[model samples]
Target chain A: SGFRKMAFPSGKVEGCMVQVTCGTTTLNGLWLDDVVYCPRHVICTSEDMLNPNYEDLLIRKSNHNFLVQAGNVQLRVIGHSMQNCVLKLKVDTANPKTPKYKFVRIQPGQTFSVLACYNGSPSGVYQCAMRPNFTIKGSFLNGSCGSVGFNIDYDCVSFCYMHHMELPTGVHAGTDLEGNFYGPFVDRQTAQAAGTDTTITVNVLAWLYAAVINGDRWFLNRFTTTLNDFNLVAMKYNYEPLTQDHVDILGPLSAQTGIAVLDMCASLKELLQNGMNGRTILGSALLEDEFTPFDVVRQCSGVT
Target chain B: SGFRKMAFPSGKVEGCMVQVTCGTTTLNGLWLDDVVYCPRHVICTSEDMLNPNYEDLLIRKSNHNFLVQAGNVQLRVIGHSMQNCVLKLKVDTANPKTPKYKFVRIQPGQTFSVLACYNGSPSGVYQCAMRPNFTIKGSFLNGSCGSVGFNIDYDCVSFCYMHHMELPTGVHAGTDLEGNFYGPFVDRQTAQAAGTDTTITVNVLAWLYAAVINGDRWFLNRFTTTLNDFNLVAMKYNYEPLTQDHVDILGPLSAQTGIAVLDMCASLKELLQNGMNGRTILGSALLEDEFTPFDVVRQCSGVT
Candidate 1:
């Protein structure tokens, strides 16, 4: 989570059909996706036109390289050591050829690589698949799914536990559940009809909570069930079976987690400079505060 | 809001800088404030050193511009019905004796000209005090003490009703209302003593909500009180009144109001570009579909 990597003389160029002075950039930012601009026009000055330092290079990183370093990330192991725990990653974008999934065990002396750890994939929108496979006796299951696909499935339990891990900064994953995000659902229609809106919102809230819980460290294209045929076939018709109003007809059930959507619509432009298109969170000083320890983490940290 | 006012071809120069390539800018937007450079920098091309088209000038109007037919702007007011909005023109920003604040408000059946609107005085900084005063409905009764500081006693009702009026975009005014704002208290020490930490959360949430409810705006220069001076001051005091803890705490209250501060923080970049800075919102069109007309609107129309 702490200054994992850095690039100097940030791969930026300046010129209009000709090369000019070169400068280095050790930008503090995320490492995915970039948007660079080659100024078609130049700055005009009142001085002699012979001044050669006229070119001001502006480079915006492509999103292909976002996923910033975590500032105040906090990880805790409950009922056992962190070594007995495993963190997996997954994604649900259109492409399946990518390593959209992987898993890793965070055991004592164990190394967790976002790539091989999350479905052995280097990085395709990273997420951690946490599975604490340790037994009360402190024995390992040789790293296989301890429990899969149950409501309180092994995955959900891990997510909930991870979310609740309190940071020294007094930030905690309260509720530890973001209304249980479910289903890429085959279609938007289905999503809309079957309360997929409800589900997606729940999932989004959970993701946001996870982000804040982990010191605002989390990423998409990871951990969620990837939908196939994102457009006509998979997502359009695959939403929940009922709309929110329909749910209302059934009266409020324990499963009905109403809309708790986040309203913030801003990005940290202050953090992500003209680097990669990535939106990375960097918090060296942000993590440790008066009430909390420094929790430098990574959201979309795996961008290999 | 929309771009500031500024003019071209008369820096004593004879050329239109970037013609209204798209969108309709008021005569004030041009000919007044210093328009920022779109092709921000400049460089010489081989053609510029040889031959270039200086005679080809065109105003590319956007399909969205409201007054497509009227290339230039002029306000005409006839007698009687024209009494509502009086067109006012500011003539200068210098001459302390005459005062830059002087302005001419045209009357019914009256006609006038706008010479220019520029901050071209005193280092390009212009502060006009021609803002309209609120029309108070009541008069002071001269207090029982017989003369209270020149007689025009402040009316509490007028101020309370001020909340009903919407502020323009890109502007902000802080308040002490429970959901509207938080603090400007003496200091963090005093804040802690009086539980100002929770109050700080209230402010961040308020601004976040202000962006959400109204539009992205920021102005807290005047709404502060002597007890609370938390308006970006206290930097030298080694205290942080508006910390994350305060935010997390205030978050719930705002959440209760259905304002999503987290969402605001997350999507700030998009909002700044699209709504506040006259850029467009992108990525998830589904998200756009979710935006109520009031939540999101085009600046040119919205500002007016």
Candidate 2:
């Protein structure tokens, strides 16, 4: 970027800064760079222009000057050259915004945040915080630094200070704010944790839906409870099925436990016996394969 | 449907039988009915064909002769009138065949059976029982009377002596066998069972998917156990979060329980704290709504 350097009304030469991708560090964690253009031409025809200290001959061009506005940014344009220009932009705990902003990228343990415009208090700004789990938890005009007021062409990426989302699978959760129900991650490594056999879990279930329909979730609870009880019977009750009359005593603990236990015995009598119908099915596999979660993420008619 | 009728090879006319959707039940469980046709003209010129026993009139016609092959059917078509012609075709546990047979209707406690032709052994007869759960449990021509051999026009709907599937819901499941995982039904009455509240269950899940992918089901187990334990914490340990050191005693119980317990605790701490990000979420609802059961029916890349 080049521009005609002038001393405003004086028409004096401000020397060579003749053009610029002008760099400066200022506005809250912002690195500003802009092209320069003289509103009008400054004519200084004094004759010895090329002399190093000539200050006169109406200074024109010189060696390209490079000034690093290193401190100006909260988000640094992380590239050594222009080759990575397109793919260079990553947005997650890291920042990127607007139409100029296209795709987004998230690193391990980072929250997805953006400077969003939603004027309410007369030109308001927000990041997202609502029933939507995908939303951020704070405000853009949130007191401290007005991080989003003007456009900053160059900015430094800031240090991530938010807390990391925890998970049971011993896997890495790539966000401070969770996605869907499970912590969102881009890669399998980040998707799964390692070496923790004792901690069994269903992370994907939570990631896609939520309970909202007719006993959808409640039904799962019922199934797991029944299935587990049956398996426990295999291991504990002498590998034998429970009897209604024999089990009625313990069932009385609930609203209708006696009959409830009777009911369970009836089905356990049946479900366990299901092995007779075709091939036998284990309780564990059944639990993992068939549960349909509700679409808490927007779908109300149940997960199709 | 009515058709002209006559005894062929006799020009003098063997009967005045005319216009009929002929009926005489024969064939395995079949009730056959076909419109009669006369290839040659049995032009009885008796001019007195209507007279009963006009033997010389060549016995051209007489009061409608009703012949009931009551002992012939294994499957009976039950309908007293024509109103049900369209919906009269209740399939399972009964008899209905071919392109003429459109919509299938299964009765309570009935197996869906069909007379399909594959023509091997000259023809092949199968009802499904491989990977799809929607197939019948037997072959049409597996000995007996050759149910799939030919078409029976009119037969009695045989007794539904097939065994009723035992279900925990105690509600009417309407089918002799299972559909998907849950029993298939047309309305809520058959969908749910009554009284036995103790028989809590998620019948809908099994109906939709099966165990096929990468720890899809297994991961669910991991999640549920952790959640249940955490809630159990509220009850068993006075609602306090458990200690890794205190709980380490049980963790070594797995392929890698020590690290596993550590993993669970890491995320239990995080998951329980998830309340900080949103309104409190209950584990029961979580299980039911968000769990996406794999589509064991067909899809392999996990349930969408």
Candidate 3:
């Protein structure tokens, strides 16, 4: 049996406490009280914290925070400071590039509530952040949420969570900066390094994407930590952290750009896997007829 | 009839006396032996100055130098230094992402010639850059191509030149760093700025694309230069340079990514043009019925 409090970081809060809890539950996960005791895992939140950092920390702390209850998606954040602030909520959606954001204003001691979903049910990880309302002068100074800026949370898991389905065999999971699990391959170099030892080429693009959205430079550095030892003759460019200047170099593998790098990696993985004993078959006449990087991408995207 | 000699930048010896004269021409350009000349436009190569600063200078001297009347595209450069160099040629093809390049090697006095096109006619702008070949050790110390290392030149303009074909009336042309022109509505605000006076919406996404490939920060800055003064009440984010970080922002408008911005801009343009007075009628009700950016892009690309 597990019991949890559904209050904000503060001790006491008064409101029509409503929350969303997913999966099997003996009892509903919504209530007017500040705490609940349940036999199964439950996520309860009557009132969300005004501090973005704290809220994100709470969500990231639990691995199963990707679900919300029913189809009613609503959030309520009661203000405590003597100033007004803006609340921004975003969800990871089918189109990651243009995720719609819902914004609202909340003043001190006031309850800010809004139904975050329209049309259909809201799914996937919902990220939220709060900033002082610049419209009201001196609100920045008065409404100071310390060490808190961006927070990503989820009311309930939905079909969107399928993107995180277990990676295929021969692929392992790696953690992102946000403590999120991502995988399909251990690292970018796994295929080239694995050579003929591995038959399947792992696609680790999702991990890189997670790093990109978080602006996880340290995680990026950790992933591309090896600067010099890469196979330059094949990789072409020197391996480095994905920076703005390196767009042309990394753009091919990038989600927004063409998948030349991904195709190239897959092709090279196959090339390395195929060989005659004690002979280099890469540049041979037989190998010359193999599909190029463009072919691989065209086939994948069905461009042709 | 007009006659001109072909020679390098400095003390010249001699080569062939071949030249092209556009329209009605007089001997107004410069030449020695191996170099060609024409009125108001001239490409000189007297001893081919070794400053690295000057060679790129000659390439940028004129804008309308996109013609070659031979099966062989040969560039003559006479030099005082005894060094071998690699000349690289890249053409902006139908696909900007994968611009194919042609390379050749030349010694001090040798004329570098290659079939720039073989079977069909070569369409699109061809850009060329020169760098010292390091067959000899420490050659890097001797020759450097300044900050301006590459120069874009048009060789027999083709369908690819449509990007510069004056943005149809409502659309204005904005120039990129490579001296290429591009544009349509300018920014997403063109309709709002133009008010309801304009009927047709401009679809000049090709210009933004031109800016993207060249990495034209200055052109991007100039185009978005009026960002701060624009309507932030509607446009939340400041008009900013299109950087790698701004991928999600611009990627939607990007040719490769999903076209949300393109759709948004086009929708807003049409919305403002269709409404009465200065008030916008494009709320959720009207917006629900509007065409998507993909629709606009498809129309622009002539896909449908």
Candidate 4:
């Protein structure tokens, strides 16, 4: 019923040759990812690129030692075969100083944490180990996710609230809930059936009513007005009266007790659908004298 | 029923001290308003700001007799008390050589007009007045309303006709008959109720038929498909058959004036709603090759 897609950029060099650029200095055709040495101090074999069991191979052949900062990161080794693996620690940071590096040994199932501040720059944290076979169970603060599964559940309530505020501006042509930027209006039924378009709207509505009841006037802006207009139009089309039944269908709306929630709902509905062309209840500064705030509200609420 | 607000900025100085800035030069703390004079050759009175009644006051004490172009304003003077008012003729213009000043007199109820090429930048006609009390009662070419009410009864029929053409895009978000931007899926009910959503939809359906019959490929878009889907959903919801009564409820429609417009309606509906999801009769590029447009239309029309 629903579909989602993602895209991102990686700075990995492509093809058999590697190109490295640091400011004005650039190097190209550096053979990499292999055990054998190649031109420009490159490694040719996967063994040399990853797990180097022999300590002699760990010797830095080139005098160019890239300084790196030991930024915030958690490294975990979880298998015996990954022992004696040469960890190429290329830590990065926002400081202009060269990258820092350190070789360390760890027992199987050992987890190590990097406490220093990581790079907030575009050249993010980079770590390449001689042993790609080892499993890192912990997460990197800014780097790519480890091969190990990471279960990170999102804050659904906060996410839905954010979307509620965004819907007005989000109505413009762009991506969808699934980020299908160049597509037709999504099939609401399909989304609903798939359960992807669930409690977000319900929770959003609930929060909106609660905010209004709490007299949070900041919500007295364009998005809420448009939202109410949307709801009013929906109810009008469905011919649903402002009642408890209608509220139940929409979902639980948080509000203060004995507040005449239903009456407030009805009044707001009237405000939205006040004029034949439906007004946003913005105020009289823009309208002819015939339309006033009191005149509009009283008409809707039946309050003489 | 609707509310709209507007905000604008004006350059009115505060306090008894007046400050005026033009290009680079600035004047500060000049005594302004009233019938008295102060340092830096400034008038200390509202009468000096607007009108001066004595000929002696018209004599420029300061050698700065700036001649200004009358530019874009109609100046009207109508009053008994405003007689002999010394009108300072400092006209602002693109050409700042000197302001042209004229000492003119008016009758008790005379309405004077100042005509000039004002704001040729926007072609905005301008008018000014020696007396601010007189009100203009005529309408502008493209500006504010006049005091005498302009009874402009819009051509609803013509407007409705125009809307019929725009429904494809307008249906998304806009002011409706009730000015409701977000509500009323637009009654198939009242359309059924008063039988007006009838002919338009029917005419639209008929126009669609002609477009399809003539092989006008331009109708190959989302809206037409959605229109058919809408009809199908309606028919499916109501379980209505392709008959004379159905046609009566809808309209005569253009093409099939007598052949029971209901049949065409049902056929188009079925065609659109061929499969469960009501995907457009899109070519196999998106839809499966099994769902042929011809097959869809034929089965719906009860042709084969």
Candidate 5:
């Protein structure tokens, strides 16, 4: 039997909570109750705390009170595929006492699907927690819940677009601050080679997407030859992946633009992973020559 | 002193050479050279020996004689911020001699970097290694590398385009992918529910970009657009990043269209680590209430 009740620093009630078990029979029902929250939640509450960064706020609500935000996180499951995951969707109201948590569990050993829906809504940002069955912890590996913020914002387009670029290029899609895409470099150095083959490549692409209801043209989406081709594309120029600008911007933009800006940063991470990029494909290839002479070509004397 | 001239298994090489030294002063040198082509090198040279499912041929040349085509890999650090890191890179040529090795001869606790370039080009795929500096014995960290790939690619863009997007609307001086392009997710669930409204947002983003050198344009680039837009906006894509089917279809198209195809598959790992989108800018902001009103609150205040 293990110890019950995770204990926290006495009377603090902010960061971590200890499992100080009331009894072993009943789990004391007091594990960290992480939740998700939108901008309204932040606005309606949080009058006391200092201007908390949105990412940090979401992380804290998800029971990950460490650093209040993700500094540099690149998490993935080893020895397991994406389908074998347990996604916990959490929401944090301004009050820590009353939190909401939802779970979207999947046990796909090899199959994983993500249905991401986006619209311009005021209440877009929330907390997302992914609990894979098995995760790496130093040399020893175990399964634990991975916490992150689901900032519903316009940033997903760039990440999703990056996935598309990396997929066919067999190279990693490059990005810059202004969402500038770099290369499919042969190697890191080749990527860094400043003046190598100055001529850039662009493929003409168009998508004929249908609406969820009838076969109506789903917004007539097309990858234009220029950024001005799409209005939403134009707005993404203002989207940031890890910032708190949404609370102020979402209310006006969601009302004005009629789109929901959620911080689905984790979704961007998923898009980046779902493929045969260098991340999954390791180093090096070899050449093998297997030559066999054809009888017909060499058989002037036709022997069977 | 590290002992030398020791006996070891030579499974890959028939009539293998073993330690039969007679106390020579150059024992260390001989041992070093002898150990070079062991399993550590075998994994890079010979494949069928490790696991059968292993298909890629990494060793470019195999003379089958004295020179078994063991090409050396080199990792030269041109620039880096974090020093004294136990830098590790992966060698993908998983031959029988494919034991992971570390670079030697570095200035201890200093800023200078260590350079190790493999001996010859034997048609192998190798990358600068990262993650779990320990616990890497055989096989590789396939899962985490992919995640890092996404991060690095994203950060690379974020770092370069630092805060170029946070311009006031209509002032529109095209934003960079660096800082100030992201954040501000107010609501999580609503954002996800709204779907696709998650267009990346940047503030006043307009800059004079050299389009075709002489043909420059001060245009608005959507940081959240697809690869097609990336290519059109930035002007390039890596062919190696493309899959086989893409190569089959787009290769001909590119050739016909007089566009150059770049093979960027090999550097996918590095791209995800230190690529354009690999870096990020972090800052904190006070809540709206931090304004006592009497301060500079009447005008638009830059608090973050």
Candidate 6:
């Protein structure tokens, strides 16, 4: 009742262009639309890129002169703070008004891309945006929103360089929340010379609380409540829901973890990062020292 | 049946010396007893301050020069690669001496302190270390091993400058994995103006799989299976086991997923420059249509 096709057997970094340095990220990582996409070929080095909290923008700051667009690509993000920020590149991809002169400066001292307090819209006070062909290889900031989001720790060379290219770092791949992060892949005999079949998971959605309490939510919530009722009719006519955002259903987190639904099928090398290989992955921010914190914090202050 | 003293009600950026700029990170974010300490006033501003797959200290890399420590601190991280890395800060912190004096140079323009390839001791190819004080604010590069560990996304002024000196930016605060990362804590009436109580979490340990299957495994796994049989007798007579390491035990990743950990703790405010309330946070490696990968990419035709 879950995973239409994501056993992710092995596609091993398919085209290999990964160069964001090293990756794996999440927190508030909830992508209930088109499941989150963008990785045909990404290569933004200098790490710390920029995340206005959770990438997939459609911004419009207007003071430091910020303008953004997704799909057909349009851009502008100048100095709000990043020790002197700047990056403009909208050479009329699909023309949103076409007027970006092409400036560039978003890679100094390493990352955080300024622009927290946006004005002029989303009714101001904050506004945050991102949802069109949706993008992410890491980029966000604590943006307040009417349409906002956050939590991330990215880099794995833009999701194995567009879905599957190669470069998972020495091996043990596939760790997903549906960002398809099969980490550190440098093994599987390099996929017998790269044909495709990428598995090696620590978690690419194996037992997700037993597949959200019992896998396959009537066909993944009928495609997640038909796209959250088309995002509540595009936030009830605020607009911008041109469709195309599906995948991710846990039926209100499976009734909030009453627990049920766990389908795991793994072997050969067994993974989900190995721990889940051992299963039990529960929660609570994790206490009960499986190892140390001085027997789970029984000593500190630099215990002599 | 949890939280002995982490209600974290108020404490606003206390010392006001946070220079790592914007921060927040986790993955295997378990802390236990002394619950992750660091921030008695610290700063590693270039961002990705190294996390050879998680930080703390006491490393031993033989070639290309590498040595580390985290208490009374010792340092040395030359370069196996980070474009052009070099840092040596152990001018006798307790003298583990050598390197003439502390150098400094780690920049991919911003984060990741470099040193993933090591030799001489613990190597499936790339070993991992970090336990002296085991650092983290965001620093890691999956360096495999017997002395291994991973998952992190650091930064937040080294935990409010050590235990509660303060930095909870703007309002909503306290979100812990025992790292005491109060986050963008710019409020709490500024902690009624800074004494400390911090709280405003989306997820920092709230009903974790019903507190790991049923709240307090009899006393948190009887102190977590008495510390994984003392980290397996501290790893079968090897060493390093105070807690928080784990040779094995999701303790139970306890019943994986419950309302997906409260929708990932209410999106934990999607932090990092929550409006840059104080302003000045610059670091980069981002690209979620922040610019334009040319629609999932293809703008490198070498054409103007």
Q: Per-residue error at B5 for model 4, in Å?
A: 25
Which 10 residues in a row give candidate 5 chain A its minimum summed lDDT? A201-210
Q: Write the per-residue lDDT of candidate 3 for residues A133-241, one digit (tens) a residue.
A: 1111000111011101111122111111001111222211222212222222221222312112111112122223222332322222211221222233224321112
- C-alpha lDDT values of all predictions: 0.18, 0.21, 0.21, 0.22, 0.17, 0.20
Candidate 4 at residue B28, lDDT?
Answer: 24
Model 1 Cα lDDT, one tens digit per residue, B1-304? 1111111101111111112211212111111122211110011122331332212211221223311111232212111110111111122221122111112221111111111111111001000111112111111110100000000011110001101011222111111111121122110111111121111123333434433433333311113222133423423322233445444644543554464444443343233223333222121111121111211221112210
DockQ of each: 0.01, 0.01, 0.01, 0.01, 0.01, 0.01
Q: What is model 3's interface RMSD?
A: 35.7
Better of 2 and 6 by TM-score: 6
TM-score of each: 0.16, 0.18, 0.18, 0.16, 0.15, 0.20
lDDT of 4 by residue, B1-304 (tens): 0000100000010111122221222222211122111111122232342333233443433323321112223212121111111122222222222112222232111222211111111111111111111122111221111101000011111000000001221111111112122223221112211111111233234334433433333323333233344555655543222334334533423233333354455455543455223122211111111111222222123220
lDDT of 2 by residue, A19-93 (tens): 112122111221212211110011111122122132221133221222212212222223211111000111122
> Which 10 consecutive positions of candidate 6 chain B have the poorest summed lDDT?
B3-12
Q: What is the lDDT of residue B300 in candidate 3?
A: 27
Writing each residue's lDDT as its tens digit, candidate 2 over B17-54 gives 12111122111222223211111111122232223122
Candidate 1 root-mean-square deviation in Å: 30.0
Candidate 4 residues A1-304, lDDT tens each?
Answer: 0000000101111111122222222222211222101112122132342333234443533223321111222212121111111122222212232112222332111212211011211111111111111222111221110111100011110000000001111121111112222123221211211111111222223333433433333323332334455555545533222334435533323223233334444434443354213121111111111212221222212220
True contacts kept of each: 0.00, 0.00, 0.00, 0.00, 0.00, 0.00
* Cα RMSDs, all models: 30.0, 30.0, 28.9, 25.2, 30.0, 24.0
- Candidate 2, residue A126: how far the Cα is off, in Å: 35
Expressed between 0 and 1, the share of native interface contacts present in candidate 4 is 0.00
- Local accuracy of candidate 3 as per-residue lDDT tens digits, B1-304: 0000110111010011122322222111112222222211122232232223434534454323323222234333232111112111111212111112221222111111110111111110111111111111000100011001111111110111111111112212211212222222221112322112111111123323322332322212211222222223123321112222333434545645333433434433333334322221211111111122332232223220
State the lDDT of candidate 5 residue by residue for B196-239, as single tens digits.
11111110010001111112111212123333433342223211
